[PDB]
Design a binder for this molecule. Structure first.
Ligand SMILES: O=C(Nc1cccc(S(=O)(=O)N2CCN(c3ccccn3)CC2)c1)Nc1nccs1
Ligand SMILES: [Zn+2]
Lengths: 98, 249, 785, 49
């Protein structure tokens, strides 16, 4: 229906290295929001849970329409959810051979 | 019944061609090198073709006295203004605007001019790609690494190359790279006078730079016999460059 | 999971509005996705007391004012002596509706049903107060519905929050105030349920815990209004004091409890074991159930008396004439429970809890809550002890972690004392030992098992707003680049697009009778086990069916000019239980005008040869060569279908649609092509081959060859190349004539022969020598000049 | 002709990541439970399996 298709597109990323931190996630998610929605985009990280990651968040971009205080795109919220992200969970690393 | 039989075509007959233009082979070599450097985080920078002798010479460690600034070898317009002889001035100007703050990691493609007669290996206007890296602990091994990537991108990875000590005013130590032997890249560690003049502290920052010539690279890669073919624009030349390329088999 | 504000402050008080509390809860991990306001629409609603009642009914309610009000009411069971719920004149209600001085007789305000005030379906058990509550009292207050409930969409790792006490631990953390668990200590009869009761598990691999207490002499009836509302709030119709006291402590501790009537169990012995082959039993459903190896039952000592986890028995349950009770509190293997419930369509709120896993910490305490309750509210009398089987083990698992590790994962900069405070306010006992904190995680948080879990707790609480922003610096340096295939695909898509074709994106799943359309090999198709939809049931073995549909769709919208391409995968089955072969295809479809400029008389209709021209522009750009030979493909025009080949292998086809397929789809002349793009991409092309422009001019001769009408022009071109020795460069058909000026069944094909020596100029005589040889070869193969 | 809007967004994200040193990787659309789920820390249990 208007908001669900049984076949859709996704882009995932995976970065795995030695000192990867969640601030490194943040910085990267920020380039993503800028790329998609403009150089002035900020992001917002909200606690959440997925099984493969931990800590996990859902990520909003600031609204590229209304500059602050709200419109129908961001649902007078200022923030639009666009990504989920998180630190990969050890079990996933260990199962992969890492 | 007869419909299908009467509407039989000869499917082997010429198709209605929808023709493709070509990208100039000089442009192809340029783009390829840009794409290589994009993926390492560089910026492609574009600047003036007509330059001040400050930027084209002085800022590059070629003082008033230098054989390089000879009016017989470069295309001057006044005593102070000339057709640039290389894309280094864009790299020198970009540096100064950084105001002592690195990293610089830039690639500067474009047309450069040399006061000379044209023949099969010399055009008075040709193309060049220069690069500049300036950052805190840049070392010559870092140069070597980047140069091998360039060679690998241009001529494939098994292609044999040769590094030879050499000398340019604006770098030290310096290097030339041959490909199996033919020279293609010149490069060096940026000379501190050059860092110091464009406002970097050569005690903190080191650099490396390089140039190569797509006209020459292309001639070598394809066996193009006369550099002037690039600037003549015979369609029987240009149309040989329509198709994609891979590494190969 | 539904969580009443009023109710939670039994255990914790956030000293804050329910919105504020939802917000803070959501901002720290658990999403409150809605807030139900049971007081929904409600103004001026008081207790009142019908003093006298006439004759629907004229009532004199004292509503706590100086004088009684008169209310007319014809509701079914209503008299004086009743304390009731009254919405005064000037009040408000759910449904709609707001009520004033009406008249006929004289009616001032409104006495109420439940529903009327706004309860629900399937959850409700005019309204009379069981207790003699002061007239004029706020009515919802007295009704325990002066309340909003928070609805949580909880994730598998937050089972703890499937309980009022677990949720109370969560919120105590968030406001770092205190929570309190509710009364569990009863007063115990001299006797013990050890003397009453026997418990064994014959299947301890599947049942870690089973246990039971006994409470004697109980007064079935109704529960107070609080027990009742809470159950309604929490989504469950309050049935009787003992069905309630179970379901309620479920909600309270998350520990499911079963209620057996002692006297109708059928022994003084309980046995937990697996159901057997085909094993029969009928459950308090009165629906009879035959079982499997893999169901857990309860038995008395040869009686399947309860499907553990899922249901009860007929016979051993609590009827209202029960007066002694065994209360079960067990742990049943999360998945045994999951599969039973599942299959018999028998999901309870108590199986669902066994699915998520149980707080070990809470089993005995939950039991003890329902015994104290049964005491308190079924006047019951409490035996000493429990009969427990099978060991619960430790209630604290210790995890070490360091501040460094926490700052190293998140990238903030917290001290031990910041970190320590978070665990202590989550109620975890922590001890520092040099740089290492040992965190005693309680069994009540079974989702915390590793240091990373503890990292998450810190992250979520201290707050993700705080994490500074950085970019990863990679010490293996590597230039990010499209692969060669990737780059070729982008360039190819630029080429198609540059020729006017729009990029389509179609569904992979088609109907099962469409899945093999245009397929090359018989290859098996891949169907879903449970399609959402007959039209999306099997993976396509071709891109064309949905591209044809998209064309039909467009054309019916009066979009007559359609040019689409797709690169997309098709799917051939690899027999059974293997992954299929996924193959990438380039396909497209074309209909309508290719070039229009009406005012200049230009109108170039798309025909086979322009479709060919697109497939050739593909080959040209990729530096490939394709060849073309007539082919028969079902669904294409038998007369206008070519097979496309690369290195002598078939990779695809190009063809006009069959007139019957086009007619079905109400299309005109329409052309598709499909190409195995994987085959195409396997060809290594290398670098472009530059050849210097020939120094010398070539020579062209034209020939006109009369030949049987069905000889393909490729055949004549091959003969010419075969005889063209060193100088024949290329050959071009420039005219084909079939008409009356020529033997019927013959055509005349005119071909331009181009000759060229790169090393020399061509003498007429050198050309003639070969040209004559070519003519003869042609003549001898039936091609008259 | 047009580029599909979904392809456009996918390409700009690839570009961004390419300039940062990443690889763009493709694999199977029909997949095994192991890789779809287990390898991703959804044991045979789970509510998403
Ligand atoms: O340092 C460079 N680049 C550089 C380094 C070495 C070699 C070459 S090269 O092969 O292209 N070259 C071109 C110029 N040639 C000259 C020019 C004058 C004198 C001597 N030789 C030699 C070959 C380029 N530029 C900078 N811009 C800003 C700061 S540093
Ligand atoms: Zn907005």
């Amino acid at each position: 229906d208007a908001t669900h298709s049984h076949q859709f597109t996704q882009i995932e990323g995976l970065v795995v290295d030695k000192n990867i931190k969640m601030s490194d996630l943040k910085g990267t998610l920020e380039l993503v929001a800028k790329k998609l929605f403009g150089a002035d985009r900020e992001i917002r990280l909200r606690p959440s849970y997925f099984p493969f990651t931990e800590p996990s968040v859902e990520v909003d971009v600031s609204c590229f329409k209304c500059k602050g205080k709200g419109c129908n795109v961001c649902k007078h919220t200022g923030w639009i959810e666009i990504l989920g992200a998180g630190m990969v969970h050890p079990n996933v690393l260990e199962m992969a051979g890492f | 019944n007869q419909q299908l039989a009467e509407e039989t075509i000869d499917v082997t007959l010429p198709s209605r061609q929808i023709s493709i233009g070509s990208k100039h082979p000089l442009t192809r070599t340029v783009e390829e090198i840009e794409d290589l450097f994009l993926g390492l985080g560089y910026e492609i920078v574009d600047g003036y073709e007509v330059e001040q002798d400050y930027y084209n010479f002085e800022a590059l460690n070629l003082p008033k006295s230098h054989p390089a600034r000879d009016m017989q070898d470069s295309f001057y317009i006044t005593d102070e203004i000339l057709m640039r002889t290389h894309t280094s001035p864009v790299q020198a100007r970009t540096m100064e605007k950084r105001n002592g703050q690195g990293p610089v990691k830039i690639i500067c493609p474009g047309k450069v001019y040399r006061r000379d007669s044209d023949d099969a290996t010399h055009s008075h206007q040709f193309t060049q790609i220069e690069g500049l890296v300036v950052d805190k602990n840049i070392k010559m091994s870092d140069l070597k690494g980047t140069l091998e990537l360039v060679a690998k991108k241009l001529f494939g990875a098994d292609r044999e190359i040769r590094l030879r000590p050499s000398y340019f005013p604006f770098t030290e130590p310096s290097v030339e790279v041959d490909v199996s032997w033919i020279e293609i890249l010149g490069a060096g560690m940026v000379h501190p006078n050059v860092l110091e003049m464009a406002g970097f502290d050569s005690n903190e920052y080191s650099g490396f730079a390089f140039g190569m010539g797509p006209d020459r690279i292309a001639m070598l890669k394809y066996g193009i016999e006369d550099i002037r073919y690039f600037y003549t624009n015979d369609v029987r030349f240009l149309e040989q460059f329509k198709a994609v390329e891979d590494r190969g088999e | 999971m539904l969580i009443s504000n009023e109710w939670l402050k039994d255990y914790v008080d956030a000293g804050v509005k329910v919105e504020d509390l939802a917000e803070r809860i959501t901002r720290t991990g658990i999403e409150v996705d809605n807030m139900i306001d049971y007081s929904k629409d409600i103004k001026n609603l008081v207790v009142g007391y019908i003093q006298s009642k006439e004759k629907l009914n004229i009532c004199q309610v004292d509503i706590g004012e100086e004088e009684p009000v008169q209310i007319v009411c014809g509701a079914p069971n209503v008299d004086a002596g009743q304390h009731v719920i009254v919405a005064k004149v000037g009040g408000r209600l759910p449904g709609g509706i707001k009520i004033k001085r009406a008249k006929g007789e004289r009616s001032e305000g409104m006495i109420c049903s439940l529903q009327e005030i706004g309860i629900s379906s399937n959850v409700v058990p005019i309204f009379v107060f069981p207790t003699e509550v002061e007239p004029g009292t706020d009515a919802l207050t007295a009704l325990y519905l002066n309340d909003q409930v928070m609805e949580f969409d909880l994730t598998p790792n937050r089972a703890d929050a499937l309980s009022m006490v677990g949720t109370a631990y969560e919120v105590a953390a968030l406001y770092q105030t205190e929570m309190t668990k509710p009364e569990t200590q009863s007063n115990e009869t001299s006797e013990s349920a050890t003397n009453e009761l026997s418990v064994t598990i014959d299947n301890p691999e599947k049942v870690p815990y089973y246990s039971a207490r006994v409470v004697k002499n109980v007064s079935i009836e109704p529960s107070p209004i609080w027990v009742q509302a809470r159950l309604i709030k929490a989504g469950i119709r309050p049935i009787n004091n003992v069905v309630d006291i179970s379901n309620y402590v479920l909600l309270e501790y998350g520990q499911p409890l079963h209620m057996f009537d002692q006297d109708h169990i059928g022994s003084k012995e309980i046995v937990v074991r697996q159901a057997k082959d085909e094993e029969t039993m009928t459950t308090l459903d009165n629906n009879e159930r035959k079982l499997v190896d893999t169901d857990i039952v309860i038995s008395n000592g040869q009686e399947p008396i309860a499907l553990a986890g899922v249901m009860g028995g007929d016979f051993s349950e609590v009827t209202e004439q029960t007066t002694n009770v065994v209360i079960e509190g067990a742990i049943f293997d999360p998945v045994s429970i999951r599969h039973t419930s599942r299959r018999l369509n028998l999901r309870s709120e108590a199986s669902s809890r066994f699915e998520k896993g149980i707080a070990t910490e809470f089993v005995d305490e939950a039991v003890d809550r329902a015994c104290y309750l049964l005491q308190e509210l079924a006047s019951g009398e409490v035996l000493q002890d429990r009969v427990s089987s099978g060991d619960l083990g430790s209630f604290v698992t210790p995890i070490d972690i360091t501040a460094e590790k926490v700052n190293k994962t998140i990238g903030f900069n917290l001290s031990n004392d910041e970190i320590q405070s978070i665990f202590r306010q989550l109620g975890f006992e922590t001890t520092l030992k040099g740089e290492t904190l040992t965190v005693n995680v309680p069994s009540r948080r079974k989702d915390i098992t590793i240091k990373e879990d503890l990292i998450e707790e810190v992250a979520r609480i201290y707050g993700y707003d705080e994490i500074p922003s950085s970019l990863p610096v990679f010490g293996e340096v590597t230039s990010g680049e499209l692969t060669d295939r990737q780059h070729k695909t982008r360039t190819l898509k630029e080429t198609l697009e540059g020729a006017g074709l729009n990029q389509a994106i179609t569904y992979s799943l088609v109907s099962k009778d469409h899945a093999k359309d245009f397929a090359l090999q018989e290859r098996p198709t891949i169907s879903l086990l449970m399609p959402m939809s007959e039209a999306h049931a099997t993976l396509r073995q071709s891109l064309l069916p949905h591209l044809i549909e998209a064309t039909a769709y467009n054309v019916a919208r009066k979009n007559k000019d359609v040019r689409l391409y797709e690169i997309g995968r098709v799917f051939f089955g690899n027999g059974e239980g293997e992954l299929p072969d996924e193959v990438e295809y380039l396909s497209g479809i074309l209909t309508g005008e290719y070039v229009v400029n009406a005012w200049q008389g230009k109108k170039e209709e798309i025909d086979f040869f322009i479709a060919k021209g697109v497939v050739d522009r593909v080959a040209e750009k990729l530096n490939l060569e394709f060849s073309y030979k007539a082919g028969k493909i079902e669904g294409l025009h038998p007369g206008r279908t070519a097979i496309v080949s690369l290195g002598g292998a078939g990779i695809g086809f190009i063809g006009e649609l069959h007139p019957q397929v086009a007619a079905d789809n109400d299309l005109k002349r329409t052309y598709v092509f499909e190409l195995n793009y994987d085959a195409m991409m396997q060809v290594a092309v290398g670098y472009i081959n530059y050849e210097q422009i020939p120094k010398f001019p070539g020579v062209t001769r034209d020939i006109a060859l009369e030949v049987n009408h069905d000889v393909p022009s490729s055949e004549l071109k091959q003969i010419i190349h075969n005889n063209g020795e060193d100088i024949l460069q290329s050959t071009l058909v420039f005219d084909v004539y079939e008409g009356e000026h020529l033997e019927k069944g013959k055509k005349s094909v005119a071909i331009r022969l181009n000759y060229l020596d790169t090393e020399d100029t061509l003498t007429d005589e050198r050309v003639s020598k070969i040209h004559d040889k070519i003519l003869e070869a042609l003549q001898a193969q039936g091609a008259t000049i």
